[PDB]
Structures are given as C-alpha cells and as structure tokens.
Design a protein around this ligand. Structure first.
Ligand SMILES: Nc1nc2c(ncn2[C@@H]2O[C@H](COP(=O)(O)OP(=O)(O)O)[C@@H](O)[C@H]2O)c(=O)[nH]1
Ligand SMILES: Nc1nc2c(ncn2[C@@H]2O[C@H](COP(=O)(O)OP(=O)(O)O)[C@@H](O)[C@H]2O)c(=O)[nH]1
Ligand SMILES: [Cl-]
Lengths: 319, 293
C-alpha cells in the first residue's frame, strides 16, 4: 500500500489501518521513519480535529476510574474517545468498539537508541504526539492523555487543557502533589469526594481555591477552578467536562486556542533539534571515554567547570 | 604571573581583585585560558563563603533588604559581597563579559572567596528568567514578596515560589504590618496544604530593621540543616557538574542556532510548521541538515 492508501484506509476505518499506522510511527527503521512523516503530512487536514485533554495524578488518586467514568459519559453523548498513556518505563488494544474507549500506550520499537538527554521519554512523547493525529484521522474527537515520573510537562505541552487529580487526606492537607505540577494545572480535582469524606474533600477544595487566590493575579484570563468529584459514584464527572469545555471557549474567545497549539508544535520541533544535538555530543566516543574522569575532577576541584566543559566539547568532535 | 596574582588577591592588594575580575570578564580567547589557570590556582579557596540568593520583583524592597542584611553582617565582623546578575563597607558588584553573566558571576564568587569575603549574596537584577540560574549557584534562595492586602500577595511569578527556601513578606511596618502578617500566615497555611526543610514564611521591614536579623538566623538554620543531613557539600559539588553540562549544552545549541543555514531558513520553517505545510519532525531534520554538523 502507498502512504495515500494507508491515509485513506485510516480515515475509512479499515480493521488493519490504525494498528499499522501505529507500528509505523513506532518504528526506528529509516524507511518507516520517512514513510511515517509522509503519512502525517498526508493526515494534516485532520490534525487538530479532537479535543486534547491531559489528565495526571499520583498512583492511587483514582485516575483510571476517573478516565473510565469520564470516557463512558462522553460516549453516552456520542463522542468517540481514545486515551493515550505516556509510559516511559513501559509498565503499560481494542480499537473497533464504538461502545468503549480506545486505550493505547505507544512506545518506540526495541531497536531505539535511548537518550542521555531524555531517557525513554523523548521517544514515547514523539510517538504519542504523532499517534494523536492518527486517532484524529480515524474519527476520534476527544483524546485524553494521561501520565503513568517526570512526564507531566511532556503531557502539558501536547494538550489544550491539563487536569490535575488530587486527594484530601483531611480538610486541611492534600496529598500526592509533586513540586512544580500544580502550576501546570488548568483544573484541579479533589477525587473520592463521597461518603463521610465528601465534606472534607470540599473543605480541601476551598482551601486550595484560597491558596490560588493568594497566588494568581486577580485579573488573569483563567483562574484554575478547584472541583470535587467521585469517580466511583459519578458525582461531579459531568461538571468536570463542562469545565473542560469552558476552558476551551475561554481560550478561543481570547484568540489563544489555535495559537497555543501552533506554539506547542514549534516548541516541540525545537526540543527535537536540541535533543538530537545534545545526544550527538553525549553519545560521542570521546565523551563516553573521558566523562567519568572529567566529572571526578570538577567534583574534587582539580578542574574548573569551564575547562571540563571545553574538554568535553573538544572530545565530541561535533563539527 | 597567575601565581603572583593569586597571592596578590589573597593578601588584599588594592589592584589585584579588579584585574582578576576584568580577566574573568574577558571575551578574548587568550585571557580565557589564563582566567582558568588562576581559578585552578584559587580552588583551595572555592567555597569558603556562604552563598545566598535573593530575589523579588522590582519595588519589593530588595536593595533596602540587602543593605540592611549587609550592615548587620558587617557589624558582626563579616566581609560581604552582593553580586547582581574597605572591610567596613559592603562590596557591591555586577559582572558581565544570561549564560555569560552567570558564568562571570559564578567565577567571581571564587575571586571574592580567595579575597576573604565570607558572605556572597547573589541578587536577580530586574525582570527576566534569571531565577533558576541564581538558585543553581547558591546554598539558600530567599524570595521577597509584598502583601497587596492581607488576602493577596503581589509579584509571584510562575515557577519561582518552588525555588524558595525562605519567603519574606517585606514592608511589614506602619499600619501595613498587620496585613503583612495576615498574608504571611495564609501563605504558610497554603504551603502546609500543599520533609528535610519546610520553607518558613517570615515578615520583615528592611527600612526599619525589624525581622532582618531573624531572616539571617533562618538562612543559617537552612545551612545547618543541610550540613546535618550530609547534603550541603554534595549539593555544591552537584551544582558544579550541572553547571559544566549546562555550558556544554549551551555551546552545542548555540552552534546549531547561530549557524548560517539555520539563520537562513528558520523563519520559513517555523511558518510552515505553524500552518501545517510541514510536520514538526521534518522541520527538525531540516534544521539539523541546515546546520551542516
Ligand atoms: N471511594 C472512592 N474510591 C475510589 C474513587 N475512584 C477510585 N477509587 C478507588 O481507589 C483505588 C485507586 O483507583 P485507580 O483508578 O486505580 O487510581 P490510579 O492508580 O490513580 O489509576 C481503587 O481501589 C479505586 O476503586 C472514588 O471516586 N471514590
Ligand atoms: N515601608 C517600607 N518601604 C520600603 C521598604 N523597603 C523599601 N521601601 C521603599 O520602597 C521602594 C522599593 O525600592 P527597593 O527597596 O530598591 O526595591 P528593589 O527594586 O527590589 O530594590 C523604595 O523607594 C523604598 O524607599 C520597607 O521595608 N518598608
Ligand atoms: Cl483560537
């Protein structure tokens, strides 16, 4: 099949087309890499047809139950939903059932050369970002991206709205808040607000809303709302989505929605450029040979950082 | 000679530190080699001073604060430098040839330490994304803020708060005192809602002297807690390696970005990504190609 036949097969819903597209984008083989991009160029008119919503939270917070509830609610309303998991450590599919969410976790193939710059993350980010376009070409109109680590920024940069799930240990203490993640959140949810715990979840939501009113400037475009939800009982699920829709409309009204996506795309391009050159240096034979000794000398003050740096640049022969 | 200059800096000879500084500020390649020989010679002195970072938006009271701290430390017999990015007076400096200023500043800290300065305050100058660069070269990072009201702080820029080992609500004087304290408590509560060290939230009036001594006590307490957990020296040694990598990363990113071919095609390539005439992956490859590595 030509790239254009595959495009057409993905759009028309052929059993085998999406899985092959996915395997293609996952490939490290040079021809597959060339073909993957031709396919994506071909699929451009579809890029962006889905809402892109990010969902994160520490393990045990109720993320998977939340995504299931939200997914089933969106399907009842006639959406066609996929959830991509960003899984650098590969501790993570049924694509044809309109009655269920598509749940995917894409990874580059075993012949990938991991990164000193990234780790596995770079390769998974790339594959995930591209698969979003594959899903959009396939007629998915909501794409949820979830973390499974330091994957939060990577997810934030590929979505329109970033949702952070948290827990109230009590009315006065939240739980599983990693440094620097809160500031990525467009919406924060206190989940498990059910039973006797509901009242404490709400208390905790208000204190957090207060926290953010102490910090965020009063005349901003979007103050992150702080909601409560019970993924198990369905309470607040519909309202989360309403709020996600509201965030999108506020971004469109400010002339900011498309621009942001377009910005993310250019930023992503640079990150790949930056990563490739850093990797070229760091996997260099000369650097691989002398690294350990050069660090040692800086650590113990036998060498300045400046000279150590120069010596590593010299040894990289990156011309 | 480099070893003579070392000795002149250590003995406090009037002219040695300024020449040392000009040398480290040199853009010219010849002086860069000598600067590093000097620094190698001065290594046994690197680290003798406390390194304390101080930031806050313009108008928050930063200069007044540094002055009050400086005068307090001198009264106690310390010898104090403030680097912006006569033993009886505070040394106030700002070196230049962000990356270039950071480099100059980090190196000058060693020059000051070799000269017998035991406290080096590093200050953000004005508006920018310099806060990380300063955090990475100090042991304790102090963030100054203001109470707009008891219920609203002002000038808390994204991602700065998480760098703060200590947060200060300054201008807690006059009728404003009570509002400054309210604000401090609510922020402490905030951070309790959200270890080795919990960042304290203090109030202070740099203009009138109140709370200045207590800020310093707290700075000292942060250092002792780091030393007690076996983390103080390691952190400095880590910063140094990170700094080396940042210079390597910067030099290679710059080699690509300043390349003629990237200069030529950049604007057009971005345009094409923006409007979907080109994928981000191909755009990246085309920029690497244009760099002629
Ligand atoms: N009470 C209550 N329990 C929940 C809720 N959502 C999830 N849980 C439970 O908490 C545990 C972790 O949920 P899971 O969705 O696996 O969280 P994840 O690890 O963040 O995906 C499971 O036992 C869930 O059944 C909720 O809304 N209320
Ligand atoms: N009431 C009061 N006023 C202050 C205090 N510190 C500084 N100011 C005044 O507020 C202005 C702030 O300037 P400065 O202290 O240089 O802030 P910077 O730009 O961060 O250095 C000055 O014109 C001072 O006179 C303080 O602690 N209390
Ligand atoms: Cl828009």
């Amino acid at each position: 099949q030509t790239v254009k036949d595959l495009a057409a097969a993905i759009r028309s819903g052929d059993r085998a087309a999406l899985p092959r597209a996915i395997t293609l984008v996952e490939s490290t083989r040079a021809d597959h890499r060339e073909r993957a991009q031709e396919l994506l160029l071909e699929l451009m008119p579809d890029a962006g047809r889905a809402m892109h919503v990010g969902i994160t939270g520490v393990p045990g917070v109720g993320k998977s139950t939340s995504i299931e509830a939200l997914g089933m609610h969106l399907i009842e309303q006639g959406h066609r939903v996929a959830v991509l998991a960003v899984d650098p450590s590969s501790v993570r599919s049924i694509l044809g059932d309109k009655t269920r969410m598509a749940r995917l976790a894409v990874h580059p193939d075993a012949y990938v050369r991991p990164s000193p710059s990234s780790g596995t993350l770079g390769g998974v980010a790339k594959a995930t970002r591209e698969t979003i376009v594959l899903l959009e070409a396939a007629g998915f109109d909501v794409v949820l991206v979830e973390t499974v680590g330091q994957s939060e920024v990577t997810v934030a940069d590929m979505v329109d709205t970033f949702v952070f799930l948290t827990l109230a240990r009590t009315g006065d203490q939240l739980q599983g808040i990693k440094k620097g993640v809160l500031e990525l959140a467009d919406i924060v949810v206190v989940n498990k607000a059910d039973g006797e715990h509901a009242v404490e979840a709400r208390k905790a939501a208000r204190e957090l809303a207060g926290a953010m009113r102490l910090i965020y400037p009063r005349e901003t475009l979007w103050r992150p709302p702080v909601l409560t939800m019970s993924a198990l009982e369905g309470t607040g699920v519909a309202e989360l989505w309403e709020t996600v829709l509201k965030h999108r409309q506020v971004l469109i009204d400010a002339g900011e929605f498309e621009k942001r996506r377009r910005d993310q795309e250019v930023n992503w391009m640079w990150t790949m450029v930056r990563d490739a050159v850093i990797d070229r240096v760091m996997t260099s034979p000369g650097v691989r040979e002398i690294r350990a000794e050069v660090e040692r000398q800086v650590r113990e003050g036998e060498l300045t950082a400046a000279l150590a740096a120069q010596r590593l640049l010299d040894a990289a022969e990156l011309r």
